[PDB]
């Protein structure tokens, strides 16, 4: 059984929100409630809407006249509709049901703001153990992903929260530490991922030539 | 949020740790509670059921108990991996799910001084007018440390920033990444990039620097 949200990562304020979780290795009318619960950054868990088997919807209260929670049959899917949205519906959107099973969750921003795509500077190594690693900077909105040589290097990774610079936009960075006697044969390369401007790229992280 | 939890708990490796959960008479009282664990990035995982059952995958070193309109986690023989954060769970009066605001969970693990490295802007960012100057602090403990950025000797306040990572999940320390950002004709100005770093591990503070010009490619 695997729950997967999708929807836009941005969406303007006093607009909706439209979302939806397709439910794979399970049919979706054997299915005891499907809902949708979600995480305002740093915060707890709210509560949105269920869907039960009969097709019977009950809503957060708070949220109510603004939620629509409907099953496609044919998709096997169920979505989630919020109207005329504001800063405050900011949060990590979860898919959920009872056969419970949660989805991976998917962030969507509420902002006047406009998507914006990554640029990726390299942060090279230089003078047993060396640091290199990846600036991903002037991107909107969250999140990236950040792997290292397609996922065979973990070891040591560190990708740090993302900061909010004063121009609006956002810069994360992604290291690791690998021994020094490698940096002449072993290939680092950073997979940057920015799905809301749909932005990927690898970028190889060589030495610097210090003196 | 309905459910009141504390903000953190923290005990060594190996230790005991429990977890508060109050409510009200409408929920908890009348109800069933649930707890969750949520390791960083990830959604949360059911960790116990109908108050203290737990369902299969969940080792015995967790379990829960309730009394009245509280509720509480218990997780014995703390291990590096155990750090994240802790949700309870309930049905109001009108049968609906609510949470708690969370717990998250600190391993005190032993002292570790940050190995401290310096990164110049790449000629590729100068060449796009900016210049980010980063410095790395790995893996210490405890959390606090103090970053302080000097220009040719002048103390840089307010143009820097910096993240934290959580706990590693393979020896519990924290990484710090602190980014000092000069546009390029700021930066061709001066000479000495230097980072200063004080924290419990370390007899004196550590700095790293460099010169513009060192460095190529």
């Known amino acids: 059984v695997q729950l997967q949200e999708s929807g836009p990562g941005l969406v303007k304020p006093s607009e909706t929100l439209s979302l939806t979780c397709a439910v794979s290795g399970y049919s979706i009318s054997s299915g005891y409630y499907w809902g949708w619960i979600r995480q305002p950054p740093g915060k707890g868990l709210e509560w949105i809407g269920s869907?039960?088997?009969?097709?019977?919807?009950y809503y957060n209260p708070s949220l109510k006249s603004r939620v629509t929670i409907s099953v496609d049959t044919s998709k096997n899917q169920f979505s989630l509709k919020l109207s005329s949205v504001t800063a405050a519906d900011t949060a990590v959107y979860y898919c959920a049901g009872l056969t419970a099973n949660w989805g991976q969750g998917t962030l969507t921003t509420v902002s006047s703001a406009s998507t914006k795509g990554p640029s990726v500077f390299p942060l090279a190594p230089s003078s047993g153990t060396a640091a290199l690693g990846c600036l991903v900077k002037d991107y909107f909105p969250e999140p990236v992903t950040v792997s290292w040589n397609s996922g065979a290097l973990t070891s040591g990774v560190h990708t740090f929260p993302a900061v909010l610079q004063s121009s609006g936009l956002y810069s994360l960075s992604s290291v690791v530490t690998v021994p020094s006697s490698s940096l002449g044969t072993q290939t680092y390369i950073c997979n940057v991922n920015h799905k809301p401007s749909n932005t990927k790229v690898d970028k190889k992280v060589e030495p610097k030539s210090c003196l | 949020s309905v459910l009141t939890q504390p903000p953190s708990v923290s005990a060594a490796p190996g230790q005991k740790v429990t977890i508060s959960c109050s409510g009200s008479?409408?929920?908890?009282?009348?109800?069933?509670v649930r707890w969750y664990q949520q390791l960083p990035g990830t959604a949360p995982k059911l960790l116990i059921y109908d108050n203290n059952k737990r369902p299969s995958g969940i080792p015995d070193r967790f379990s829960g108990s309730k009394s009245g309109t509280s509720a509480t986690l218990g997780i014995t023989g703390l291990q590096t991996g155990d750090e994240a954060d802790y949700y309870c769970?309930?049905?109001?009066?009108?049968?609906?799910?609510?949470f708690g605001g969370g717990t998250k969970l600190e391993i005190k693990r032993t002292v570790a001084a940050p190995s401290v490295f310096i990164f110049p802007p790449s000629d590729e960012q100068l060449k796009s007018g900016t210049a980010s100057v980063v410095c790395l602090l790995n893996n210490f403990y405890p959390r606090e440390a103090k970053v302080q950025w000097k220009v040719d000797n002048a103390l840089q306040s307010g143009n820097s920033q910096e993240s934290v990572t959580e706990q590693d999940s393979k020896d519990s320390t924290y990484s710090l990444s602190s980014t000092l950002t000069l546009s390029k004709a700021d930066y061709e100005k001066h000479k000495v990039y230097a980072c200063e770093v004080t924290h419990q591990g370390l007899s004196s503070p550590v700095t790293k620097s460099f010169n513009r010009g060192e460095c190529i490619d």
């Open positions: 769970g309930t049905w109001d009066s009108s049968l609906n799910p609510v």
């Open positions: 008479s409408s929920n908890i009282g009348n109800n069933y």
């Open positions: 869907i039960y088997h009969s097709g019977s919807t």
